[model samples]
Target: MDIDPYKEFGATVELLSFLPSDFFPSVRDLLDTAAALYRDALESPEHCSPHHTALRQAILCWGDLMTLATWVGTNLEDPASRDLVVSYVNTNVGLKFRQLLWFHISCLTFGRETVLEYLVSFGVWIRTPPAARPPNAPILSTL
Candidate 1:
């Protein structure tokens, strides 16, 4: 499952157009941090603490977030691009020794959702997590 955020970049950009000016930066930052945590998990799976449920939740949440962000490019029809998506997922982080299994699952099921379901689900979670900041920094709770 090769997903290309750049290919569907315009769609995400258009989807994000309705929000306030600050929203893009916030989303970008959160996405970056989530991606970073994901990478960290890849490098230090044991230390990443997969035995803990919350950490697994965090990992899956970020994985789903990454999936959603690049959903448009996740067309399973193209073998080359699909392979790229597979590589994209494999390169990211996962729980314990479960990385390969989760990568396989994501590859097989990427972009398999129906349009209505995707749209409906997308509407359900419009509020993204806050961007990272220093301890004294104020964090906005709402999208």
Candidate 2:
């Protein structure tokens, strides 16, 4: 499994605005960690130690790309980079992969809590109704 600190990208981006104004150092440290993690993961596809569970790996990929997109979209200030990431994700990463990755992250992050507030905390005011439980839901629940 991938050992990426970039795994926290999406959630970190969402939390940036909420970071305390006086805590720039802490925030910068976290962002630095995110960048390092992303770079490491991007370069080291060969060294697979399996520290990350399969589910975490999926979420890390999904969120890492998303964070890259969000950063490029907003911070890079380059229309080309933004559009490149948009097109890349669209053409390279299939929708099925997105759904499967999100499913894993959702299960990991949203255990037993599907309230509207949960979505709001993530910066969305609307919450999607949880999808139908999978056949192996019981087995996973016991985990």
Candidate 3:
């Protein structure tokens, strides 16, 4: 804001810096509370319906995500248990990481985007995983 990237813009990225450290912790609480809403929403709905598994996992993933949000205040950066931030090619990472405040915060009051849309976008589930690979395995260099 003080520099000469210069009225280039008041970038949204900078706004996070000005927010109180406690702000995200408060946010973490809201998600857990909202997740409770989602959990309770499910029990009343019928079982074995369309998108049943998807809904179940979305609820589960939301729990993990909000917990990770808590970690930003807890012990992030030294090593973010926050692996979702590292894997941008994966659907889970891009949405929250891409639209950290927009989709995530709005999704709380509104609703989450459909999980089915994400799968086709990433082309992830179209293929199965390779059985053998290590995290540290290096990629091949091109000529």
Best by lDDT: 2
Screening candidate 2 with a backbone cut-off below 3 angstroms (N, C-alpha, C), the clashing residue pairs are none
Model 2, poorest ten-residue lDDT window?
19-28
Per-residue lDDT over 95-137 for candidate 1, one digit per residue giving the tens place of the 0 to 100 score: 2113222222222233213322333333334443335323332
lDDT of 3 by residue, 78-119 (tens): 554456444433344434333333223333333334322332
Could you give me the TM-score of model 2 versus the true structure? 0.28
TM-score-superior candidate, 1 or 2: 2
lDDT of each: 0.38, 0.42, 0.39
lDDT by residue (1-143, candidate 2, tens digit) is: 85433243333223333322331223224334434454454246554333225444554666677777777688767788778877777554534343333333443344424412343443321122336333321222233
TM-score leader:
2
Error of 1 at 71 (Å): 2.4
Off by over 4 Å in 2: 1-52, 78-81, 94-96, 99-143
- Ordered by lDDT, highest first, the candidates read 2, 3, 1
Candidate 3 lDDT:
0.39
